[PDB]
């Protein structure tokens, strides 16, 4: 039938068909871009919303694995012993002055990492809050692991605009954020027709590229980056 596109995923059918049993059948192939994840032979009587439900569990497992393997580093605020965790914050990057540390009594508050070779830094509550404000991680910061490092960089000379498939990771009905194109356009203060030109694929007539400020502001508003 038709190739079902769910965000960065694309379920394309086989051009030829087969007859498993007596009923008509086709091979549906799940794709994550150029990566093939599954082939499932399905009847032709299924609707698109039912093949979507058939392939939904593999997509859910992929999203769980992506969220787990790209989780931001967690910092821990502890007392002068290191046993009780008073507050924990997930950070996009570690503090600059972290070194290998074991808490002692001369300082009341210590900011240690969650990794077992715990780096640390003696802080007060005011400096801890300054570091937490500066270094905090957005709730959907795990999607940055699925994106290239040259589309997320803040250096304008080394920045490359995201493609349509890399843009489907963060905007779209079946995206990893779950926001529609109209909602993304409303977040950028532009028309939905212009954003559809950003998300347009294979239509070489009137296809546009997103800009540096628009891309980084969209990543700010969706909760993916720059939301410390």
């Amino acid at each position: 039938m038709n190739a079902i596109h769910i965000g960065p995923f694309s379920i394309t059918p086989a051009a030829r068909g087969l007859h498993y049993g007596g009923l008509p059948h086709h091979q549906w192939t799940l794709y994550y871009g150029p990566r093939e994840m599954a082939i499932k032979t399905l009847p032709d009587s299924y609707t698109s919303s039912e093949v979507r439900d058939e392939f939904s569990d593999i997509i859910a497992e992929f999203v769980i694995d992506a969220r787990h393997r790209y989780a931001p580093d967690v910092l821990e605020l502890v007392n002068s012993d290191g046993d009780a965790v008073l507050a924990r914050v997930a950070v996009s990057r570690l503090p600059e002055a972290l070194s290998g540390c074991i808490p002692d009594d001369r300082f009341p508050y210590w900011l240690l990492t969650a990794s077992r070779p715990r780096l640390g830094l003696p802080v007060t509550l005011n400096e801890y809050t300054a570091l937490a404000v500066e270094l905090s991680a957005p709730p959907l910061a795990w999607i940055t692991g699925l994106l290239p490092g040259e589309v997320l960089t803040h250096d304008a000379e080394e920045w490359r605009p995201p493609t349509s498939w890399e843009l489907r990771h963060v905007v779209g009905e079946g995206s990893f954020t779950g926001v529609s194109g109209a909602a993304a356009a409303a977040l950028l203060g532009m028309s939905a027709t212009n954003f559809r030109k950003y998300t347009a694929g294979d239509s070489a007539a009137n296809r546009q590229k997103i800009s540096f400020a628009a891309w980084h502001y969209l990543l700010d508003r969706l909760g993916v980056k720059r939301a410390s």
Binding site: A14, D73, L94, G100, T113, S115, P117, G149, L152
Partner: protein
């Protein structure tokens, strides 16, 4: 109008076997049938991060934290023993006739044009250049993929088999015959009619291909690698597994066939880089650039349409390439 059929499945010719490995010493190559096999064992590796970073920020604590907990892996490794310095690789190549006949098709009119256009090709020029070029890749140890980068001297001995006994024996120095130039030699030429007779269907050809390589004393040999199912913890990941048939390191048969197929030297770009494998869309994944782009009129598919549907014959060096995709097989045709 002679439209193209939906299915164009072709049988693979030049069918190789799995090239299993055994170890030994030089000057004992004659009585090498009792050489011990190369076993694949396990060893633990530890390393730090050596790939590029995300480069968005310059935090030093995170990279130091990656050195705090280095990654631990167990990798399959194959080594020659401490008393052996020669690696033996043996496989059998089966040569089949009937190259132009498809295994499955969907039009009798289409096939009768295919079997006729390959008859007119063979009558004008038979299986001579490809059989000669398939003899080069058997002469040099190209099937010793990474086992040829620093070999002191690698020797290839192939024996033609009849009834279970040798028919005629070839002996080659693989350093003498390079991986770039398709020159002419009497033993190379004498091997060509045997491949030519097998490919034309006039006789049966079975060759036992043996390669002895001076890898070094106790050095590392490189069999084919398998997939990693990633069903273990991050420490016992088993990040590398090697292919073994029966407790003996071996190379995949399709990897051996790829070495034989590396005879394509008429791709549209500059041919001084070296030969590539005959393959639709001229694509090799090492350099990642596919020669014979379908935008240009030089890939296998468009010439197959011109050489058959509208009878536009390309240059004779390209007709060697079009039959080179037919002789290696493949699932062609629009699905």
């Amino acid at each position: 109008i002679l439209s193209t059929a939906s299915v164009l499945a072709f049988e693979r010719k030049l069918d190789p076997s799995d090239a299993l490995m055994s170890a030994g010493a030089w000057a004992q190559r004659d009585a090498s049938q009792e050489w011990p096999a190369v076993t694949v064992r396990e060893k633990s590796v530890r390393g730090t991060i050596s790939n590029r970073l995300k480069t968005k920020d310059r935090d030093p604590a995170k990279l130091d934290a990656s050195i705090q907990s280095p990654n631990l892996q167990t990798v399959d490794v194959a080594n020659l023993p401490s008393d052996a310095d020669t690696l033996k690789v043996r496989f059998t190549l089966r040569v089949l006739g009937g190259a132009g006949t498809p295994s499955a098709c969907n039009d009798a009119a289409y096939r009768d044009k295919l079997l006729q256009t390959v008859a007119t090709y063979v009558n004008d020029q038979g299986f001579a250049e490809l059989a000669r070029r398939y003899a080069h890749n058997l002469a040099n140890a190209r099937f010793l993929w990474r086992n040829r980068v620093g070999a002191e001297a690698v020797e290839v001995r192939i024996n033609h088999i009849r009834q279970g006994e040798v028919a005629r024996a070839w002996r080659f120095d693989a350093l003498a015959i390079g991986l770039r130039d398709f020159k002419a030699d009497a033993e190379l030429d004498a091997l060509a009619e045997l491949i030519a007779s097998g490919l034309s269907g006039s006789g049966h050809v079975l060759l036992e291909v043996v390669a002895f390589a001076r890898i070094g004393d106790g050095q590392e040999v490189f069999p084919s690698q398998e997939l990693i199912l990633d069903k273990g913890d991050k420490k016992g990941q088993k990040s590398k597994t090697l292919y073994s048939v029966r407790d003996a390191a071996a190379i995949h048969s399709q990897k051996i066939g790829n070495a034989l197929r590396t005879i394509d030297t008429w791709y549209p770009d500059e041919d001084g880089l070296g030969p590539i494998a005959v393959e639709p869309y001229g694509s090799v994944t090492s350099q990642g650039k596919a020669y014979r782009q379908p935008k240009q009129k030089l890939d296998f598919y468009t010439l197959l349409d011109n050489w058959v549907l509208r009878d536009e014959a390309p240059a004779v060096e390209q007709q060697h390439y079009v039959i080179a995709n037919l002789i290696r097989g493949g699932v062609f045709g629009e699905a």
